[PDB]
Design an enzyme around this catalytic site. Structure first.
Site, short mmCIF file in Angstrom:
data_model
loop_
_atom_site.label_atom_id
_atom_site.label_comp_id
_atom_site.label_asym_id
_atom_site.label_seq_id
_atom_site.Cartn_x
_atom_site.Cartn_y
_atom_site.Cartn_z
N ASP A 39 37.32 39.24 47.16
CA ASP A 39 38.69 39.65 46.83
C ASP A 39 38.64 41.06 46.25
O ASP A 39 37.72 41.83 46.57
CB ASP A 39 39.30 38.64 45.85
CG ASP A 39 40.82 38.52 45.97
OD1 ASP A 39 41.50 39.57 45.87
OD2 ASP A 39 41.34 37.39 46.16
N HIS A 69 44.73 40.99 41.88
CA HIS A 69 44.74 39.82 42.76
C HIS A 69 43.50 38.96 42.56
O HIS A 69 43.59 37.73 42.42
CB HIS A 69 44.86 40.29 44.21
CG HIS A 69 45.06 39.19 45.22
ND1 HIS A 69 44.02 38.53 45.83
CD2 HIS A 69 46.20 38.69 45.77
CE1 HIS A 69 44.49 37.64 46.68
NE2 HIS A 69 45.81 37.72 46.67
N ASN A 161 51.03 34.11 54.94
CA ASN A 161 52.31 34.06 54.23
C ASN A 161 53.49 34.54 55.08
O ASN A 161 54.49 35.02 54.53
CB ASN A 161 52.26 34.88 52.94
CG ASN A 161 51.16 34.44 52.00
OD1 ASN A 161 50.94 33.25 51.79
ND2 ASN A 161 50.47 35.41 51.41
N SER A 224 47.39 32.87 49.01
CA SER A 224 46.25 33.35 48.23
C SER A 224 46.08 32.58 46.94
O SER A 224 44.96 32.49 46.42
CB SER A 224 46.47 34.82 47.88
OG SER A 224 47.71 34.98 47.21
#
Ligand code: CA
Lengths: 279, 6
Positions: A39, A69, A161, A224
């Site tokens: 990430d 994130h 998404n 996520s």
């Protein structure tokens, strides 16, 4: 063990019903396992990780999380208050820049790194990878995630998404790994969550409170966010001996709550990840 | 191509 007034997603994945507020779990809490948060990084000094989080690799001038994130995703894996696997070892691999972007080459190399790096880390109960990222269909990205998975790392990826079928996204569309959709606190599919046959599982994804940089916390939404519950559950269930890497996605499928969710289109599993803890 | 946080 019982953690009261818990984040709704932790309470949910130890519950047979919605709207409860206590996360139940075995005190072994993933000790002796390892999760690679692949990430934007991890603010490993955050008090919520208690020294159990390290940065192992970066493909940029810095290894710091300058976006937020990855620190959030890592917290759901294993932060002391917001994590599923509160004793797991967290390894960060920064493949995304501080704007949240990464070239596919970088993403492949990082999966390759973890395939080898696990042989240098003490993870006797198992190793898990969490990939809360994705883009358009790429055979090579998919091949790279297969290759991890094959190297004995249980690999959990975000479905994406766009409210569309996940077959047209990677590494989401790779059959050999564990693709994770999102659900909300009222047992609806998240309206943005991708769907389709390649999904293996749905975990909690809307309004997810977790660790954020600067020693802060916040709530955000996404697959996520869904993907880290399942990795931490994957890492938790492996420490209990219940399952292996090769087989944890299937085990989490078999023992998941069935039929609880609404807003699921035909052809997608109605399965919400559940930890199966009876005190 | 470029992948992105979800
Ligand atoms: Ca699978």
């Amino acid at each position: 063990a019982a953690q009261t007034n818990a984040p709704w997603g932790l309470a949910r994945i130890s519950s047979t019903s919605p709207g409860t507020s206590t996360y139940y779990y075995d005190e072994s809490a993933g000790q002796g396992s390892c999760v690679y948060v692949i990430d934007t990084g991890i603010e490993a000094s955050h008090p919520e990780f208690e020294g159990r989080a390290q940065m192992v690799k970066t493909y940029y001038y810095s290894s710091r999380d300058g976006n937020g994130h990855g620190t959030h995703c890592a917290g759901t894996v294993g932060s002391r208050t917001y994590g599923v696997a509160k004793k797991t070892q967290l390894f960060g691999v920064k493949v995304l820049d501080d704007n949240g972007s990464g070239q596919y080459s970088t993403i492949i190399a990082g999966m390759d790194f973890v395939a080898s790096d696990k042989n240098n880390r003490n993870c006797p109960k198992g190793v898990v990878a969490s990939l809360s990222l994705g883009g358009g269909y790429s055979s090579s990205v998919n091949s790279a995630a297969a290759r991890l998975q094959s190297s004995g790392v249980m690999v959990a990826v975000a479905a994406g998404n766009n409210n569309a079928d996940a077959r047209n996204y990677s590494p989401a569309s790779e059959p050999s790994v564990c693709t994770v959709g999102a659900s909300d606190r009222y047992d609806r599919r998240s309206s943005f969550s991708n769907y389709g046959s390649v999904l293996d599982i749905f975990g909690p994804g809307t309004d997810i409170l977790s660790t954020w940089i600067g020693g802060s916390t916040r709530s955000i939404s996404g697959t996520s966010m869904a993907t880290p519950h399942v990795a931490g559950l994957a890492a938790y269930l492996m420490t209990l001996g219940k399952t292996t890497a090769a087989s944890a996605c299937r085990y989490i499928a078999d023992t998941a709550n069935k039929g609880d969710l609404s807003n699921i289109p035909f052809g997608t599993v109605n399965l919400l990840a559940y930890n199966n803890y009876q005190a | 191509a470029a992948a992105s946080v979800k």
